Design a protein around this ligand. Structure first.
Ligand code: CLA
Ligand code: CLA
Ligand code: CLA
Ligand code: CLA
Ligand code: CLA
Ligand code: CLA
Ligand code: CLA
Ligand SMILES: CCCCCCCCCCCCCCCC(=O)OC[C@H](COP(=O)(O)OC[C@@H](O)CO)OC(=O)CCCCCCCCCCCCCCC
Ligand SMILES: CC1=C(/C=C/C(C)=C/C=C/C(C)=C\C=C\C=C(C)\C=C\C=C(C)\C=C\C2=C[C@H](C)[C@H](O)CC2(C)C)C(C)(C)C[C@@H](O)C1
Ligand SMILES: CC1=C(/C=C/C(C)=C/C=C/C(C)=C/C=C/C=C(C)/C=C/C=C(C)/C=C/C2=C(C)CCCC2(C)C)C(C)(C)CCC1
Ligand SMILES: CC1=C(C/C=C(\C)CCC[C@H](C)CCC[C@H](C)CCCC(C)C)C(=O)c2ccccc2C1=O
Ligand code: SF4
Ligand code: SF4
Lengths: 80, 142, 69, 139, 73, 741, 40, 73
């Protein structure tokens, strides 16, 4: 499956979490930003790689990246 | 004795044969004759058409040099007036709006001052504000 | 060091405004990895395809910015 | 086990396939306050029963799209929908929401996963980890 | 004619491949610290100037060449 | 005492918003930050649905913009009349129509383009025109240039009237939404008051004006001696001596003794031997009957007196076993969404334009139109391309409706729901038929090509070999040839000689002759079928899957025009309906290109030509279609290379402007490939470097330049591609047809 | 009016006006002095 | 021959422009500062950040191949 990595420039804006259509991301308490929350990717085995999370990130470049790796049935989005 | 493969159009049999049937470009019936007499000065190949030589010699300076300065002056004029207008706009608290909606007074004022673009360019280069330092310019990661 | 109404140059080396000049909008208390907030005149590439504009603000650490004023 | 009456639907050719009976499928359950009509993620419109409704789909993305439609396209907001994964062996795995709290909001007890302690500009060069089975982000 | 066309096409393919595999080298096998401040790393220092002046020369050729051809036509 | 309901002065007339571009859109209102703001501005302008959520305001904007397009068309028509009145040889051509080429464009001699002012006969120099305005004007009873000038002045006046009408009906008195929704009254008025009344008025014009003038003209009377049209009205004896029944007045009309008018209201059929066009009496009875039919039809829908059917009742009453609710719910769809109406109207109008192009050539209405091969080819190809574009637009705006205005709540188990519920079977069966047609049609051409290349002409699909005879088409041609005898006893001759019969020839050229069909005709007609079914497949898949699909289950939330869904799921490039339209444009282009190529070659090879006094007919290309059009090499050699000589060798003559344009067509096409083959990331990086360059000299623009968006890149590529290809074909056809006599 | 003045000064109107002026200059000059291949 | 040699020069400089720009930007650029982490040949970075179609160095080679073929023609 693909790998979703989140770096320390996240500001807890939750935009990446809301933009995720397959419910891969989540919010976990943190202490490095004002919101005291950081994104997390506990269910990367369901990610397809649509890059909506990257599209929604407001920080300079991205605090979240998706690297496409091994393709499974879930990752390839196959209904058959 | 250069261009032994080229001949003056005055004594070129092909050019002379084909020059009596020159088409009239404009409504003036003499345009063909004027072109025929004006093209007899240049050098023609065996096909009867004039050729241009740009080796740098001043005998053929009409082929490339005179038009070269003529074009370069106008191009420098346009570039300089555009650059100066852009720089002046950059400090108006909304440069983009004045970029789509042209400030016609300022635009024409900069237009009328472009004939001194070489002196302005050399003055800017000497003053050091023509070229920005490499440390002040955004660059992509290496 | 950096405070309100400042003029600083970016050294993130991957930011869109690397080498650009921005203004320090505000700074906050400690405990934040990148407490400085800097806004820029030019906008970055952020946004969906065909978007009208981008984003003209970001957060930086104190070691990634150099004073100009 | 899973309990619920299927919504009133005439069926369509965009429904399940052999994957559901061979590999896996998904189920979504929600309590509608009143009977109404909702757009099938597979095409067409279906009337959903008042009370508990259960629906089978082929992909998790379709189930979550239906859940988003339920949450955002009805004045009485449907917040109790649950999405499970159904295996051919009969085992039911509960997927969404993970802990009864929507991921859009922070909830104490979750463990950070996939979080790096460095900026994206501090990743190592490939040449330092070549001939290894890793990637610059993976290290 | 066949020999000229054949070996010229082969040369074009090889010249494309050289740049392709050089780009691969830059992606994979280039160590910035080892080559710090030498010619290889210094190429990337004025790469923007390279691309800018190369764009200018390409445009300068194309504009005034297509112009001459269209004028003659 | 009317259903009229308007609002007074809803939008004040002021100039301020002119100086603020992008006022309509909130996204573009705050000002430009990147160059994209420019491209968005010119793209979202006339999209009134997105600007506001009010149906009434959108409808008012549509009404005003339609007034504007009418004004533009009026200006164009008046300009055509003016340029035909002042800068044309129509008066000279009228005296000698068989020796002088029509011409209405004259070129200023400035840089040598005066060579374009070639001699069109009669001592007049100018561009030959193939739009066919001269034949239309002669059929309309035009004899003097002053009449054309007056027509142009009237057209300008009417264009000003339409502009003022738009301004008034929007900025001052804007109709309410309920007024827009009186679809029954609207159809009543447009069917009776527009089509029926217009056709009746044209029939009156033809009978009272066009018949006497054209009867005199075809009889050898000089154009300068023919009485002015109002003289026939002012002196009815002049009309009566041309047609004896006019001596009986209007008494036979009201007494239903219509046979009296048989002398000038005929059912001749065929073509006029003198001019090669249709009989004007046939067209007079035709347009009169059309007027009667449309006026009768215009009283169908009940408006204000309870007499007439109601559209909703008819829609809700036609429902069967297989459809459940049937046509129920469509009335609310078509009375609340402009996009559905636009789709239906676009499809029908495109099909109608194709019908027009297909039906004009076989039976030319205008005098001397058949004898002018260039005019025939130009008119046919032009209206065919128009129809194809309109059909593609229908396929586009239908998907737009499906994405935006479709509401599942009000469409439960109706016909649209069952569209969305068995769409997969539709698309699968359509894909199969497209593949089967492609194989069993194009593989025939490839098999013929290989058999010919292998020296096995006896194994080919040819008339001298394995034959594919279109027996059904030949049978229907035979049936239509026998129609004047017994099936339509009151018809003197056939509807068109294309079906069969005698060879109508004007002057020394063939006006129309029978068009036989063989193996090549069978293969080409089935190729057309394959291309059309494929274009339908693309557009129908775009419309049906616009809302969502198995790959993307929430496509409608992304919108109608989005580039992709990302590299996830293996890659989701071109999943929107807009991309389906972008893909269908190419296939429409291919299909229409094949159609026009087939028409041109068949007409040149088996129809057009010259007639010797002995009666023998020598065709333009000596009938090589039946033996060459069965292989792709035949199309390459005997059609493209062979007929491109007249355009490649056009330099130094009046036709040189075509040759230039021909090369121009070959250029932009290639240029378009640099948008379709590439992507925007590379161009963005190149723009980054160039921006660094302009920044070094402190000349960087305030508006940050950005590479074109993915959707914009695709649009630019397809637009320049179609432009290049169509310009190439236009130049080729015009240079070929203006050189085959 | 102010709005008309602002609209006339927008980018497309300016660029097309300048292009028309330049085109007119060139066409007139070539009308009076054509076939100028070089400075004699 | 003068015109065609200058056209060939245009083609050579343009193909070299494409190849060199791809090779230099393979390491990274403003649009993708971390291209090296994504390998030599990857599809895109999604429709975000304005759209990133044909952004890999492999895609630069793919574009340069067409110009090579045209110049050889
Ligand atoms: C290799 C390329 C090359 C270059 C860059 C030049 C450049 C030049 N040549 Mg040249 N030349 C060349 C090849 C070249 N040549 C070849 C191959 C031949 C043999 C046919 C010649 C034969 C030739 C002659 C016979 C003459 C030149 C002259 C000149 C100079 C003209 C000065 C001028 O117009 O500026 C003036 C600019 C302003 C007034 C502003 C210029 C520096 C002229 C010279 O020597 O001038 C000093 C001259 O008379 N050239
Ligand atoms: C000395 C020659 C040489 C060598 C040893 C290599 C070696 C390599 N190259 Mg390279 N390359 C070369 C020349 C060479 N290349 C040239 C001349 C070009 C320019 C076209 C390229 C362009 C190139 C690219 C763009 C890429 C490589 C890559 C690679 C690496 C792995 C992938 C690969 O090549 O195998 C796999 C090769 C293939 C699958 C090619 C199969 C395609 C076939 C041959 C096409 C045949 C057409 C068809 C049969 C025609 C039928 C005709 C019929 C109808 C009559 C490998 C290190 C890849 C890389 O980065 O990996 C690290 C990569 O992305 N190369
Ligand atoms: C005939 C087709 C064609 C043309 C004209 C161009 C032209 C260009 N390409 Mg391109 N390209 C093409 C096909 C073409 N390409 C194809 C098929 C591919 C493969 C995908 C590429 C791949 C490619 C790449 C990868 C790159 C280019 C680049 C360039 C530019 C380099 C400058 C140059 O060569 O001449 C100068 C340009 C011209 C002569 C073209 C201008 C001609 C017009 C007519 C001038 C007048 C403008 C006109 C009047 C405007 C009217 C508008 C109005 C009517 C609406 C130039 C804009 C490079 C670039 O950007 O360089 C900076 C670059 O990086 N192209
Ligand atoms: C007899 C009545 C009548 C007639 C002739 C028309 C005619 C027309 N309507 Mg219409 N309409 C009518 C009643 C009528 N309407 C009623 C009652 C309603 C309310 C329910 C509407 C509501 C309506 C809408 C909402 C729209 C139209 C539109 C149109 C135009 C469509 C474009 C077209 O056909 O091109 C053919 C064009 C012409 C033939 C040019 C005709 C130019 C003028 C306007 C004709 C005036 C003729 C008049 C009878 C006097 C001449 C008689 C004598 C002096 C010779 C067309 C001109 C569309 C539009 O915007 O167009 C303005 C449109 O969107 N209609
Ligand atoms: C809108 C259509 C139209 C108009 C305005 C006219 C107008 C006219 N027709 Mg006419 N006509 C028309 C259609 C029309 N026609 C058609 C379709 C037919 C075929 C049935 C006729 C057959 C016809 C005959 C046979 C006669 C007229 C006559 C007349 C004139 C006197 C009748 C009158 O106005 O009082 C009522 C008048 C100029 C009479 C006349 O003397 O005109 C020269 C006359 O004898 N018309
Ligand atoms: C009666 C005809 C008609 C009408 C009223 C509309 C109305 C509309 N269309 Mg539609 N359309 C039509 C026909 C029509 N269309 C046809 C025939 C097609 C098939 C090609 C389309 C394809 C289409 C698409 C794909 C889209 C629309 C959209 C729209 C909406 C407005 C946005 C727009 O296009 O403006 C802006 C218009 C432009 C930017 C056009 C300017 C550029 C054109 C293409 C240049 C044309 C060049 C010219 C032919 C030759 C010049 C040569 C040059 C050298 C001078 C609006 C509802 C858009 C939408 O979704 O809105 C809801 C949209 O995305 N239409
Ligand atoms: C040398 C004498 C001379 C003569 C006899 C003419 C005569 C003409 N010019 Mg003209 N012109 C001239 C000098 C001259 N011009 C100069 C020096 C310029 C450069 C500014 C122009 C720029 C020019 C343009 C741009 C146009 C004309 C047009 C015309 C024709 C329309 C009448 C007119 O001038 O109003 C119209 C004049 C203008 C719109 C601009 C005049 C600019 C003034 C003279 C400065 C007419 C045949 C027009 C034409 O033929 O219509 C298509 C046209 O479009 N001319
Ligand atoms: C004539 C030239 C040679 C053509 C021969 C080809 C014939 C092949 C198919 C037979 C036509 C059958 C139409 C019956 C269909 C018909 O009678 O519909 C009747 C039925 C609706 O019946 P109801 O009485 O319920 O209808 C209520 C109506 O009022 C509408 O609500 O519609 C359906 O069942 C739809 C299913 C059609 C699904 C099959 C579609 C076939 C698509 C391909 C068509 C191929 C021919 C195309 C060439 C024009
Ligand atoms: C000043 C200015 C600007 C900027 C200008 C800048 C920054 C310019 C920078 C230039 C640089 C850095 C380098 C320039 C190099 C020029 C060279 C190498 C010239 C070579 C000339 C040759 C080879 C002459 C050749 C022969 C010369 C001879 C006279 C005959 O013909 C024959 C022939 C053709 C052989 C802008 C862009 C901002 C705006 C402009 O309007 C003005
Ligand atoms: C004339 C003459 C002469 C001279 C000559 C010369 C001097 C030559 C030169 C030549 C040259 C001078 C050539 C060169 C070429 C080059 C090229 C062709 C290049 C290429 C490159 C590339 C391909 C790159 C790549 C890369 C990269 C990018 C990175 C990494 C690395 C690499 C390298 C891989 C003589 C005296 C002898 C004699 C007489 C005559
Ligand atoms: C070349 C190219 C670009 C770069 C092209 C750009 C930025 C367009 C530049 C247009 C210039 C600025 C103007 C030319 C067009 C105008 C309509 C000309 C108007 C002329 C009148 C004013 C006279 C892309 O952005 C792109 C994006 C996606 C796929 C392919 C491509 C692509 O091929
Ligand atoms: S979108 Fe970016 S900044 Fe916002 S929560 Fe997600 S990772 Fe953090
Ligand atoms: S290549 Fe372009 S269109 Fe395709 S998925 Fe990537 S960004 Fe989207």
């Amino acid at each position: 499956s693909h790998s979703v990595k989140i770096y320390d420039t996240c500001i807890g804006c939750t935009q990446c979490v809301r933009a995720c259509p397959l419910d891969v991301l989540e919010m976990v308490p943190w202490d490095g930003c004002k919101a005291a929350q950081i994104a997390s990717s506990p269910r990367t085995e369901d990610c397809v790689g649509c890059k909506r999370c990257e599209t929604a990130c407001p920080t300079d470049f991205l605090s979240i990246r998706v690297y496409l790796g091994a393709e499974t049935t879930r990752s390839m989005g196959l209904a058959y | 004795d250069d261009f032994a493969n080229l001949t003056p159009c005055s004594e070129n049999p092909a050019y002379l044969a084909k020059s009596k049937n020159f088409l009239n470009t404009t409504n003036d019936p003499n345009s063909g004759k004027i072109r025929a007499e004006r093209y007899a000065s240049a050098l023609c190949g065996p096909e009867g058409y004039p050729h241009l030589i740009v080796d740098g010699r001043f005998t053929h300076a009409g082929d490339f040099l005179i038009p070269s300065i003529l074009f370069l002056y106008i191009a420098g004029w346009i570039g300089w007036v555009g650059r100066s207008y852009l720089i002046e706009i950059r400090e108006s608290k909304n440069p983009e709006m004045q970029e789509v909606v042209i400030n016609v007074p300022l635009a024409i004022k900069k237009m009328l001052g472009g004939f001194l673009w070489p002196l302005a360019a050399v003055g800017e280069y000497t003053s050091g504000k023509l070229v920005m330092k490499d440390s002040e310019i955004p660059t992509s990661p290496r | 060091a950096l405070n309100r109404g400042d003029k600083v140059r970016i050294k993130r080396t991957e930011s869109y405004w690397y080498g650009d000049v921005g203004t320090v909008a505000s700074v906050e208390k400690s405990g934040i990895l990148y407490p400085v907030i800097v806004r820029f005149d030019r906008v970055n590439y952020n946004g969906f395809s065909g978007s009208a504009s981008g984003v003209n603000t970001n957060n930086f650490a104190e070691n990634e910015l150099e004073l100009v004023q | 086990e899973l309990s619920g009456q299927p919504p009133k639907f005439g069926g369509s050719t965009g429904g399940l396939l052999s994957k559901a009976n061979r590999e896996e499928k998904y189920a979504i359950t929600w309590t509608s306050a009143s009977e109404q009509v909702f757009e099938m993620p597979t095409g067409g419109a279906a009337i959903m029963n008042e009370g508990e409704n259960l629906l089978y789909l082929a992909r998790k993305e379709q189930c979550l799209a239906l859940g988003t439609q339920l949450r955002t396209k009805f004045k009485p907001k449907i917040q109790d929908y649950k999405i499970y994964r159904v295996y051919p062996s009969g085992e039911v795995q509960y997927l969404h929401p993970a802990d009864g709290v929507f991921p859009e909001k922070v909830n104490e007890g979750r463990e950070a996963q996939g979080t790096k302690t460095r900026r994206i500009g501090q990743n190592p060069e490939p040449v330092t980890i070549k001939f290894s089975g890793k990637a610059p982000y993976e290290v | 004619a066949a020999l000229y066309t054949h070996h010229q096409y082969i040369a074009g393919f090889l010249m494309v491949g050289a740049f392709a595999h050089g780009a691969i080298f830059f992606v994979r096998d280039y160590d910035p610290v080892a080559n710090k401040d030498n010619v290889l790393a210094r190429m990337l220092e004025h790469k923007e100037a390279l691309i800018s002046h190369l764009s200018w020369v390409s445009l300068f050729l194309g504009f005034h060449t297509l112009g001459l051809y269209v004028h003659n036509d | 005492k009317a259903k009229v309901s308007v609002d007074n002065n809803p939008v004040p007339t002021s100039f301020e918003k002119w100086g603020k571009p992008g006022h309509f859109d909130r996204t573009l209102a705050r000002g430009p930050k990147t160059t994209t703001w420019i491209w968005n501005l010119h793209a979202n302008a006339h999209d009134f649905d997105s600007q506001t959520s009010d149906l009434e305001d959108v409808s008012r904007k549509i009404f005003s913009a339609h007034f504007g397009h009418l004004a533009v068309v009026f200006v164009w028509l008046s300009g055509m009349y003016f340029h035909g009145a002042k800068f044309s040889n129509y008066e000279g051509w009228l005296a000698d129509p068989t020796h002088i080429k029509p011409s209405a464009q004259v070129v200023w001699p400035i840089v040598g383009q005066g060579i374009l002012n070639g001699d069109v006969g009669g001592g007049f120099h100018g561009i030959q025109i193939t739009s066919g305005l001269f034949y239309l004007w002669r059929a309309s009873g035009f004899t003097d240039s002053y009449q054309l000038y007056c027509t142009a002045i009237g057209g300008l006046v009417m264009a000003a009237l339409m502009l003022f009408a738009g301004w008034f009906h929007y900025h001052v008195k804007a109709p309410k939404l309920e007024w827009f929704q009186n679809v029954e009254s609207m159809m009543n008025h447009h069917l009776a008051g527009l089509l029926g009344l217009g056709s009746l008025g044209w029939a009156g014009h033809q009978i009272h004006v066009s018949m006497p003038i054209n009867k005199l003209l075809d009889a050898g009377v000089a154009p300068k001696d023919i009485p002015l049209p109002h003289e026939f009205i002012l002196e009815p004896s002049k009309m009566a001596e041309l047609y004896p029944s006019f001596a009986q007045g209007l008494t036979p009309f009201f007494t239903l003794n219509w046979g009296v008018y048989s002398d000038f209201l005929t059912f001749k059929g065929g073509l006029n031997p003198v001019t090669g066009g249709l009989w004007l009496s046939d067209t007079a009875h035709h347009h009169l009957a059309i007027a009667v039919l449309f006026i009768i039809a215009g009283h169908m829908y009940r408006t204000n007196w309870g007499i007439g059917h109601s559209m909703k009742e008819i829609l809700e009453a036609h429902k069967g076993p297989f459809t459940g609710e049937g046509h129920k719910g469509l009335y609310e769809i078509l009375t609340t969404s402009w996009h559905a109406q636009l789709a239906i109207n676009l499809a029908l109008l495109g099909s109608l334009t194709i019908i027009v192009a297909q039906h004009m050539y076989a039976m030319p209405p205008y005098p001397y139109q058949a004898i002018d091969y260039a005019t025939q080819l130009s008119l046919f190809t032009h209206h065919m391309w128009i129809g194809g574009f309109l059909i593609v637009g229908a396929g586009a705006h239908g998907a737009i409706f499906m994405v935006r205005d479709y509401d599942p709540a009000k469409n439960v188990n109706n016909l649209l729901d069952r569209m969305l519920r068995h769409r997969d079977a539709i698309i699968s069966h359509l894909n199969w038929v497209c593949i089967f047609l492609g194989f069993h049609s194009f593989g025939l051409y490839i098999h013929n090509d290989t058999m010919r290349a292998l020296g096995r002409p006896q194994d080919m699909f040819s008339d001298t070999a394995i034959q594919l005879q279109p027996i059904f088409a030949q049978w229907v041609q035979h049936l239509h040839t026998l129609a004047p005898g017994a099936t339509a006893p009151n018809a003197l001759a056939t509807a068109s000689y294309a079906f069969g019969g005698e060879t109508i020839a004007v002057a020394g050229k063939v006006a129309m002759m029978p068009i036989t069909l063989g193996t090549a005709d069978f293969m080409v007609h089935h190729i057309h079928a394959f291309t059309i079914h494929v274009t339908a497949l693309i557009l129908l898949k775009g419309v049906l899957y616009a809302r969502s699909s198995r790959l993307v289950p929430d496509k409608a939330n992304l919108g109608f025009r989005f580039p992709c869904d990302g590299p996830g799921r293996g890659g989701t490039c071109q999943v929107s309906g807009w991309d389906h339209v972008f893909l269908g444009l190419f296939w429409m282009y291919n299909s229409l290109s094949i159609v026009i190529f087939h028409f041109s070659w068949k007409m040149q090879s088996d129809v057009w030509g010259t007639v010797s006094p002995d009666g023998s007919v020598t065709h333009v290309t000596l009938g090589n279609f039946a033996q060459s059009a069965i292989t792709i090499n035949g199309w390459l050699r005997d059609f493209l290379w062979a007929q491109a000589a007249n355009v490649i060798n056009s330099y130094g003559s009046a036709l040189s402007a075509y040759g230039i344009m021909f090369l121009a067509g070959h250029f932009v096409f290639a240029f378009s490939l640099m948008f379709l083959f590439s992507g925007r990331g590379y161009w963005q990086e190149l723009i980054e470097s160039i921006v660094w360059a302009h920044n070094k000299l402190n000349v960087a623009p305030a508006i940050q330049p950005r590479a074109l968006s993915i959707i914009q890149g695709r649009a630019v590529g397809v637009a320049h591609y179609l432009l290049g290809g169509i310009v190439t074909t236009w130049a080729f056809f015009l240079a070929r047809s203006l050189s085959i006599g | 009016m102010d709005g008309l003045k602002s609209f006339l000064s927008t980018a497309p109107v300016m660029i097309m006006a300048l292009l028309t002026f330049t085109a007119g200059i060139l066409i007139e000059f070539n009308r009076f002095y054509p076939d100028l291949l070089f400075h004699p | 021959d003068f015109l065609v040699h200058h056209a060939i020069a245009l083609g050579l400089h343009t193909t070299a422009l494409i190849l060199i720009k791809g090779a230099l930007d393979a390491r990274g650029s403003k649009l993708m500062p971390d291209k090296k982490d994504f390998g030599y040949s990857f599809p895109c970075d999604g429709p975000g950040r304005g759209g990133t179609c044909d952004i890999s160095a492999w895609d630069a080679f793919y574009l340069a191949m067409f110009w090579m073929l045209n110049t050889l023609g």
